[PDB]
Amino acid sequence: MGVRKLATIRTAGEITPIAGAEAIECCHVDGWTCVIKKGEFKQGDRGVYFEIDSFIKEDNDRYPMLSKQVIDYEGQRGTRLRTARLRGQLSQGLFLPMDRFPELASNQVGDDVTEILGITKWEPPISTNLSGEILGEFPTFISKTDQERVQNLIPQIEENKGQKFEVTVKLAGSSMTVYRKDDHIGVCGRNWELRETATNAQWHAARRNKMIEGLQFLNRNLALQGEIIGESIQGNLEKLKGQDFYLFDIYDIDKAQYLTPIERQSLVKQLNDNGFTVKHVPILDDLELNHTAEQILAMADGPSLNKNVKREGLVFKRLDGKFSFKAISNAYLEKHKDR
């Protein structure tokens, strides 16, 4: 991915009634489903769609329907959009008619108005031992690990029908990159490269599975990208003792592209055959893409790495390693509306 477009211009899709409810109805917006007030949209209308995790500052003219969910976040009063279920209808996000945004009248469908509207992403406080000291910015020559959501890739999901995809269990921790470029080998979080300390959990996991010595061994300019999970990391959903790294991507720094999935488990073999114990995120059966966004979301729920807990979702990586996305489990999101 790259740059989250929390507020976008979109078109109302199919609009369907909600049984038992007379003042509301269900509106499809790309792969999302959203409860709207009767009489705000007809199919094909333009509107501003705010995704879940949007933080929308308090405003009684533009957002008067958001006033009974007002909280404090970073010192600002405002509303965090989260997954909900109204009259049995799953509802995600906020969809508002163009007439409430005259200043956006000239924007086109697909335009990102996040910064025009002052929208920010709500996020939990990060863990104490995953903050360490910084050596410098996240490397400009390594890609970051954000994935776009399948709900937003409707044209791309059939463009890629017939294509094949590696299917991996999405693990709930924090992103972690261990990389080599020539003489230097570094450990990063999701946003910063980190200097080694006794307490830093990223370095401690990297030392414990000898992935620094493994990168020296392989003698290539590679970024090993994976998730650090376990105790004291985003609630430790997998019920693990301690912390550990689970790989999900390898980035070829020199060719500035990701290793394809088969190239990646070959290297994970090789690393382990040589005593460098780097685990991988659980791998499921490949998928030959012939599906709708809603059918893909149906795959998302299921067993996690711990086969006794229900997983955050799945990540799909095309076998050429050049088109990837996540499908997050709505069951998971509904279970966790309180985090």
Ligand X SMILES: *P(=O)(O)OC[C@H]1O[C@@H](n2cnc3c(N)ncnc32)[C@H](O)[C@@H]1O
**β-strands 243-252, 279-280 pairing:** parallel
111 vs 148, beta carbon nearer ligand X: 148
For position 276 contacting ligand X by CB under 6 A, the verdict is no
Q: Should residue 224 be labelled a site residue for ligand X when binding is judged by CB under 6 A? A: no
Q: Which is nearer to ligand X, 268 or 315 (CB)?
A: 315
Nearer to ligand X, 54 or 89 (CB): 54
Least Å distance, CB 109 to ligand X, is: 25
CB of 172 to ligand X, least distance (A): 7
For position 18 contacting ligand X by CB under 6 A, the verdict is: no
Among 11, 107, 131, 147, binds ligand X (CB under 6 A): 147
Q: Which two tokens stand for residue 228?
A: 């650090």
Closest C-alpha among 318, 315, 286 to residue 300:
315
Count of residues that bind ligand X according to CB under 6 A:
13
Least Cβ distance, residue 145 to ligand X (angstroms): 4
Residue 175 makes contact with ligand X by CB under 6 A = yes
Token pair in block for residue 123: 């996020």
Name which position in 41, 179, 245, 248 contacts ligand X (CB under 6 A): 248
Using the rule CB under 6 A, is 251 a contact of ligand X?
Answer: no
Q: What is the 3-state secondary structure (H, E, C) of the chain?
A: CCCCCCEEEEECCCEEECCCCCCEEEEEECCEEEEEECCCCCCCCEEEEECCCEEEECCCCCCHHHHHHEEEECCEEEEECCCEEECCEEECCEEEEHHHCHHHCCCCCCCECCCCCCCEECCCCCCHHHCCCEEEECCCCCCCCCCCEHHHCHHHHHHCCCCEEEEEEECCCEEEEEEEECCEEEEECCCEEECCCCCCHHHHHHHHCCHHHHHHHHCCCEEEEEEEEECCCCCCCCCCCCEEEEEEEEEECCCCEECCHHHHHHHHHHHHHCCCCCEECCECCCEECCCCHHHHHHHHCCECCCCCCECCEEEEEECCCCCEEEEECHHHHHHCCCC
Touching ligand X, residues 39-98 (CB under 6 A): none
Shortest distance in whole angstroms from residue 324 CB to ligand X: 7
Site map (CB under 6 A) of ligand X, residues 280-299, x = contact: -x------------------
Position among 114, 168, 304, 329 found at the interface with ligand X (CB under 6 A):
168
- Site for ligand X, residues 300 to 319, rule: CB under 6 A: 315
247 in contact with ligand X (CB under 6 A): no
Instruction: List the one residue from 170, 264, 311, 318 that touches ligand X (CB under 6 A).
Output: 170
Closest CA to 191 of 229, 145, 226: 145
In this chain, which residue has its C-beta nearest to ligand X?
175
Q: Taking CB under 6 A as the rule, does residue 333 contact ligand X?
A: no
CB 149, min distance to ligand X, A: 8
Least distance CB 87 / ligand X (angstroms):
28
In whole angstroms, the minimum distance from the beta carbon of 139 to ligand X comes to 15
Interface with ligand X (CB under 6 A): 145-147, 168, 170-171, 175, 227, 248, 281, 315, 326, 328
